[PDB]
Chains A and B, each alone.
With several copies, the nearest count.
Chain A
Amino acid sequence: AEISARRNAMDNASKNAGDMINRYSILYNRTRQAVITNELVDIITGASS
């Protein structure tokens, strides 16, 4: 009965961390993206002067 439970539980863990991965993936790309823009600006401003 326990083995069944362990199976089912671990199963849901995989579903959740599955869904979490999805979220953080989206957040990752945002941060990446901005890191590029904010980094770039620093240069542009340094450059106009």
Chain B
Amino acid sequence: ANLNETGRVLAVGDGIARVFGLNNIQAEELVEFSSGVKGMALNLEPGQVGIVLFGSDRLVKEGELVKRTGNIVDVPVGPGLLGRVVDALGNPIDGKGPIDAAGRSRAQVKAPGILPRRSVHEPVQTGLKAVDALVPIGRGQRELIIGDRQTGKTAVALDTILNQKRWNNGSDESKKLYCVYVAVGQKRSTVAQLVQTLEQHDAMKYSIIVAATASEAAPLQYLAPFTAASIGEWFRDNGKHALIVYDDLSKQAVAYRQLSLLLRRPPGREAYPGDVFYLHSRLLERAAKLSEKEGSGSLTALPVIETQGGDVSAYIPTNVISITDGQIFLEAELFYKGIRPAINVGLSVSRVGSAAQVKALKQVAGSLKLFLAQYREVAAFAQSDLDASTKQTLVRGERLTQLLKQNQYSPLATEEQVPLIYAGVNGHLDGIELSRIGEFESSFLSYLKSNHNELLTEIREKGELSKELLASLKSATESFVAT
């Protein structure tokens, strides 16, 4: 009788269920069905409530009794979550007991606006030469990773999650960045091994993983990044720093195309609903840097787009690039030639980190960006004549790209990168063989680690460079060129 906490299924199909009654229900509120399957109240019409199933349709029957939750779609949040692995409803799935919560954030929270915000300025050290030097990422910035399948998109992201161990270890409360790995549309097998390798590097203790694998329900795979968003949001709110990774948004978008087409909304470009932008925009807008008045918490979106035959111009990628604060376009043609991480320079850009990067490196990498980005169009006009003007500048761009080459699971510290860029743009290494470039990288750090120890220590204390440390290192460089 009292259809006010309850209703009955009138019809169910294609991941939706039209329930009768539920008169006190509110939009976006959660609902439980006779077999404990959670749905969500999409639209409310006179007569019936459209409800989206967070699961198999099989688990529902026309006729079933449906209960209200009074909760709008929401997750457990707070410190406890770290070192655990949950699904789209913060339900524990590693089997390591119950989720230890601080409270419960909605998966649908609004973005910090114009005023509580503050220009991003602390760097997020990725340990990746090509990244840190060229497209550096500040805390609160939202940097895209956009490549073809099999390009080292996760590699890049994973490696950052690894590198934070330098900081998440020590007493320092402000140098700490916690990691949130959303696993949208991935395999169960892939995630296992991805947790394994995060435990193999200990980084588990300081990271939370939310995963909605390729088997799970469309609205789970859709709701996953959002709920992860709130999980991370807790840190950004309680004056700490968090790094969320959306792997990937392209598979999230695709789940949305699912629901949207089963709810019979018109298809736009590539059969996508007109609101597929708003999906990602309203998500990313949450990764953010706060003002001194609001604790100065920060949350760093590393979404991953995956393109198709290298296509940047596609309708999803454009949308996400027109949302993010730049992108790290990883090109396959380079990666096939053994260049790793295969960052296309003239197609990657950090938009707000070139003022967030560690001083030391910016000093030692004067313009390095468009050097290499206009070095690419030149070497691609040779296969003509001997021109010792641009021929001379070639010996650089090759030793330089040879210099960005980073073997996987190799997080370098800032002080270690700076001397390499030094010798790069100062050309201390041109007389060293092309197949002895990366080999020397190991030889040189062996040379610096027990001699010019303070050079490393002071760049690790300040992060700046006086003209004092310039000549002090311009003796440690040509020294090893002779010895």
Binding site for B on A (CB under 8 A): 12, 15, 26, 29-30, 32, 34, 36-37, 39-41, 43-45, 47-48
Contact = CB atoms under 8 A, between A and B. Distances in A.
B269 A36 contact: yes
Interface in B296-323: 309-311, 313
A36 B272 CA distance: 13
B310 A26 contact: yes
Q: Does more than half of chain B's interface fall in helix, strand or loop, or is it mixed?
A: loop
Interface in B216-270: 264, 266-270
A47 B311 CA distance: 27
Interface of B: 264, 266-271, 309-311, 313, 383
B266 A47 contact: yes
Q: Does more than half of chain A's interface fall in helix, strand or loop, or is it mixed?
A: helix
B270 A26 contact: no
B383 A32 contact: no
A29 to B, nearest CB: 7
A12 B309 contact: no
A37 B270 contact: yes
A2 B224 CA distance: 66
Given A29-B309, A30-B309, A47-B266, A37 B271 contact: yes
Contact of A45 (B266, B310, B313): B266
A45 B266 CA distance: 8
Contacts of A32: 313
Nearest to A27: B309
Contacts of B269: 36, 40
B384 to A, nearest CB: 10
A37 B269 CA distance: 8
A41 B383 contact: no
A43 B156 CA distance: 37
B59 to A, nearest CB: 29
Given A37-B271, A47-B267, 12 more contacts: A26-B309, A26-B310, A29-B309, A30-B309, A30-B311, A37-B270, A40-B269, A41-B267, A43-B267, A43-B271, A44-B267, A45-B266
